[PDB]
């Protein structure tokens, strides 16, 4: 926990979008700025969620610095949510701070994924494909997120994600492109 980039921000109310109706736009306007724009000294955390309540977004919680995340207060790439949101700037963090566990990982729940794999790897079709394939091992990761409707359909798909524990020690460096800890202790202030 060497960085001291805590930038808090709040929400804004709008009538033309639900939580997914701006969460899919957040997934569209954060990943490309973290990919085509990029920056390993910039990301996000998830320190204010819950399991049963399904709290996905409740406040500004980012991880930046004096130069890498210093363009998070003069950025016209996030312009348009002035009817539904806002942002802040980084503040001086203290010595003893926490570090929450998160992950922006991909969970898979295919019970017929063995059949779609064997269609190009085994030739075992759907007729005899119920002998030893995983019928219920492909579980679902139920959690609250936005409903990103890709070309498969217009319905709101669930945003699977795994939380983590809380350790007093920290780990500075780099995480995945989504900000979830792929080896690095994520921030939770």
């Amino acid at each position: 926990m060497a960085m001291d980039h805590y930038l808090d921000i709040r929400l804004r109310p709008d009538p033309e979008f639900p939580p997914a109706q701006l969460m899919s736009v957040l997934f569209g306007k954060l990943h490309q700025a973290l990919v085509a724009q990029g920056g390993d000294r910039i990301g996000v955390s998830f320190p204010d969620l819950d399991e049963s309540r399904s709290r996905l977004g409740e406040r500004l919680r980012i991880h930046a610095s004096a130069d890498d995340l210093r363009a998070l207060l003069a950025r016209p790439w996030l312009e348009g949510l002035r009817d539904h949101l806002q942002f802040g700037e980084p503040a001086v963090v203290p010595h003893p701070t926490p570090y929450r566990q998160v992950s922006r990982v991909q969970a898979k729940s295919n019970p017929e994924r063995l059949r779609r794999r064997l269609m190009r790897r085994h030739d075992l079709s759907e007729e005899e494909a119920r002998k030893r394939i995983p019928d219920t091992v492909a579980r679902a990761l139920d959690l609250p997120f936005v409903t990103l409707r890709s070309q498969s359909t217009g319905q709101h798909f669930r945003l699977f994600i795994r939380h983590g524990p809380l350790q007093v020690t920290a780990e500075e460096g780099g995480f995945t492109c989504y900000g979830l800890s792929k080896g690095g202790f994520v921030p939770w202030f």
Binding site: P15, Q21, L22, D83, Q151, S152
Partner: protein, 293 residues
Amino acid sequence: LSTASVLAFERKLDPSDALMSAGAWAQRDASQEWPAVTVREKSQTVDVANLPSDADTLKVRFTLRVLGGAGTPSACNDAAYRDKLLQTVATYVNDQGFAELARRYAHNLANARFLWRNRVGAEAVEVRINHIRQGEVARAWRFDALAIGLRDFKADAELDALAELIASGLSGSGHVLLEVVAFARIGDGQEVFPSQELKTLYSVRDAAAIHSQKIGNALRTIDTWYPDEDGLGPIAVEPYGSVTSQGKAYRQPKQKLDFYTLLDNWVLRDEAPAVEQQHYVIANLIRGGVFGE
């Protein structure tokens, strides 16, 4: 004296269907002859459509209709209810001008309040609105949605002329006919979100349109006297107002600020609800519905 068993009010600012259509840039001054959008379905069996590769543009097409004199109703059973409603509607008319409604109408005309989900990740918004008397136009505008922020009502120089025009409109001082159309910046190969019915995106033939009620909703985001928290912004005007998107229903009937009791008090026995309620009252009279017994 008591309530009104039947009531029927007539709508104001009715739009047509906002067809989508495409194009390019620097041909936006030659947009009489322009192409359209397509509708296709993919693999469940649902619909999803898309712009081409030549086009960031998307286009809007609708036109408006004021009538004038909205206090006087068109269906009742009590003649005495009319004889008790006329003093109230004339009292609200004569003592002040209707421009407070008109700013909050005409900035939603000027902003991208009707381009609801057409700026979820946009960069430059340019809207052009016509005042049509006859076969040409004679008072042309071209508005911007970057300037006035989508939750406050702070007026600019363009807004007062359109406000006094529409306030001449809905008060009976001259019929106006707006045409409010827009040009978008979407994305080169980007998924569209048109309307539906009660999956199938609502497809007008060889185009794609959204219905009348979405824009007849969008141009009357006038409720910002709803009780609980006024820092949020404008939501629309409904008697027993419930909203799915923000979830919580404003203006509950178990405390006294819903439409069905302030109408009883403001109209009949000539006692006044607040001056921070009046334009919401007359916006309810603009909307219309069956307000019975």
